[PDB]
Amino acid sequence: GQNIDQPTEMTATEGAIVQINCTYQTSGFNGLFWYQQHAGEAPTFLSYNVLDGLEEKGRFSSFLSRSKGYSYLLLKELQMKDSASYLCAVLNTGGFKTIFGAGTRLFVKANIQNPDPAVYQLRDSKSSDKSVCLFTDFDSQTNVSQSKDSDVYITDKCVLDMRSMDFKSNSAVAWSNKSDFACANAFNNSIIPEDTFFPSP
């Protein structure tokens, strides 16, 4: 019954407000905690609540309802750097132990200013080409799905924040053993916009 966090996931856009809900059932509640855990670093303390209810603490709010066994962590003016796991935890017994929930993975989606989705073919630096496709510059709404084919590997959404030109971009990588597999057929299993640029020569 113990500790229930949103799990495994939550997704939101960088400008947004996210509410990470948690419910707990324990014998002797000595307070509730939230920790931030970036993959795959150590968790860091975020908040401790013992009394009802809401507490501001900067850009991150933390609510407690003792009667309901409920907590939420509210994240406002969301940033790319908030993409991490958020752990709900309770202190029980007589201090001595902090018990954790399963954790909520929060993926922050980048608000793309000027998007031009395209699938580009990248040749290998050494020799044989081995073929990689890059689906980049697409908007947050776009969801990259895994391939229908076993022999083709797809690495879901990645945001490249080029600090220099105040730019951040979405991407997904697709590669497959010399079959041949093509860039036009790489992202077939995914929901890609009608205006996607397709170059090959």
Binding site: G40, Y120, R123, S125, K126, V132, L134, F197
Partner: protein
């Protein structure tokens, strides 16, 4: 703060090892947690003082010693494949509330056979001419493949200096053949620069992959090179084109 060693480790099934945790914060409460996928952190054992050891809720099959106030040792006496996870140590002073101080984390892989240990193959893919003309930006893609286990750190180095701006790496390494229990892994990363940076053939781009494999104390009598902890890199030079 809290210091935990090793940071990476491959054990053969049946073998034994110890995880060390040292606090330089003068705390009385020490803790050993494990964390797997579907997770979360699960306490193995804990200690309230210099000579006391306690409770679960996942205590089988580890032992724990607290001899000094500074150190809390987790012993693996018979390593099982189930024991492969990320171990985290924690220190707490109460009543001083009550916030946990977490160690850096220990990634352990327990394998039946040590010959299944493979370092990665590393490749950089050069930016498309089409992306350069279409965006005035240039994306390098780095792929680390055929490695076992998932103990990898990928960094990008441009002209001998580590770059962070413009880099995006998978937080989790993909399983090449997912149903396989001993499946190799793959990892991808991207480096996006300006077209004119890529166009400068003096600019030197490198994707460095640090793999953590076999220890010095591991006996290896095989003909193939011992899959020791090493760096595997692939590099690209700027293209005039």
């Amino acid at each position: 703060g809290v210091t935990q060693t090793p940071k990476f480790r491959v054990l053969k099934t049946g073998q034994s090892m110890t995880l060390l945790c040292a606090q330089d914060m003068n705390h009385e409460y020490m803790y050993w947690y494990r964390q797997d996928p579907g997770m979360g952190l699960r306490l193995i054992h804990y200690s309230v003082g210099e000579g006391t050891t306690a409770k679960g809720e996942v205590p089988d099959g580890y032992n724990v010693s607290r001899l000094k106030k500074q150190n809390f040792l987790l012993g693996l006496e018979s390593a099982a494949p189930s024991q492969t996870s990320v171990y985290f140590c924690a220190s707490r002073p109460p009543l001083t509330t009550g916030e946990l101080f977490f160690g850096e984390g220990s990634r352990l892989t327990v394998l039946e056979d040590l010959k299944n240990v493979f370092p990665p193959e590393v490749a950089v893919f050069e930016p498309s001419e089409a992306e350069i003309s279409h965006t005035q930006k240039a994306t390098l893609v780095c792929l680390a493949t055929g490695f076992y286990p998932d103990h990898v750190e990928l960094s990008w180095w441009v002209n001998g200096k580590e770059v962070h701006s413009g880099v995006c790496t998978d937080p989790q390494p993909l399983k090449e053949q997912p149903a396989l229990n001993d499946s190799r892994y793959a990892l991808s990363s991207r480096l996006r620069v300006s077209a004119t940076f890529w166009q400068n053939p003096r600019n030197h781009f490198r994707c460095q992959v640090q793999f953590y494999g076999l220890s010095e104390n591991d006996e290896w009598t095989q003909d193939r090179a011992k899959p020791v902890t090493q760096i595997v890199s692939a590099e690209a030079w700027g293209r005039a084109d």
